[PDB]
Design a protein around this ligand. Structure first.
Ligand SMILES: Nc1ncnc2c1ncn2[C@@H]1O[C@H](COP(=O)(O)OP(=O)(O)O)[C@@H](O)[C@H]1O
Length: 238
């Protein structure tokens, strides 16, 4: 409300979005058209922020409908999101249904193979150290969060997975894996924050298994935005 909030200087600006202040417990998130990979690979593609903001709002709404508490308040066309302000826990929570990305790179897993169960991986969000994977003991010792919190985070992650996986599967999409971030609101509540989009999920077409996520950009597979749009279309957002 009073969208001219954009004229202010962002509380924080990252490689893909800008966080603007609205008040004490709310922020405006701007999904820019910046797309990155590696972030040694970069470009600006028209419609990226629009599509990710649109997809993200729908997925958060779906999560909220299944009981998952998120930071989502509302979507403001074309690429804005009003969210509850939270203090992000410096951990990237990765849930994997199919082996891909670093998993196949670091361990003897066959690419595209269905995992026996959703693997949950916690990566430390720290550029200086190259976002190293963590184990519970390390995370606690670093003071990133308590054991109780870490496990609650895992529970939330798996719930998010069951909801999203079922949803995309019904839309002919295979949710390979995804990365979420969690933060605490003013009341100390653990909320799924950041975004849930083709930038943070690996999505394959069920039939052909064509890539529909940011991997087409990092691996130059074709029209990234056109594939991102396929996701929007599949979710009935266009
Ligand atoms: N509701 C929120 N409250 C405060 N900051 C948030 C919220 N959601 C996400 N963020 C922060 O916004 C940033 C996202 O920017 P990008 O998406 O630019 O991440 P980088 O900052 O690229 O990892 C992250 O640092 C994330 O922790």
């Amino acid at each position: 409300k009073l969208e001219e909030i954009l004229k202010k200087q962002p509380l924080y600006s990252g490689k893909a979005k800008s966080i603007y202040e609205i008040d004490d417990d709310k922020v405006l998130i701007e999904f820019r058209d910046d797309i990155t990979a590696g972030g040694a690979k970069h470009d600006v593609k028209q419609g990226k922020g629009y599509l990710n903001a649109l997809i993200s709002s729908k997925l958060f709404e779906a999560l909220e409908e299944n009981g998952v508490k998120t930071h989502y308040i509302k979507y403001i066309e074309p690429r804005y999101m009003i969210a509850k302000k939270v203090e992000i826990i410096p951990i990237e929570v990765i849930v994997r249904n199919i082996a891909a990305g670093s998993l196949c790179r670091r361990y003897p897993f066959e690419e595209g193979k269905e995992l026996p169960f959703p693997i949950v991986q916690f990566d430390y969000k720290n550029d200086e150290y190259g976002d190293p994977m963590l184990n519970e003991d390390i995370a606690v010792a670093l003071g990133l969060a308590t054991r109780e919190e870490l496990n609650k985070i895992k529970e939330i992650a798996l719930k998010v997975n069951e909801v999203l996986k079922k949803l995309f599967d019904e839309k002919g999409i295979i949710l390979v894996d995804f990365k979420i971030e969690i933060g605490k609101d003013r009341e100390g509540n653990l909320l799924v924050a950041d975004e849930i989009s083709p930038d943070t999920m690996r999505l394959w077409d069920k039939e052909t298994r064509d890539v529909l996520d940011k991997d087409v950009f990092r691996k130059d597979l074709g029209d990234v935005i056109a594939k991102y749009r396929i996701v929007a279309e599949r979710l009935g957002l266009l």
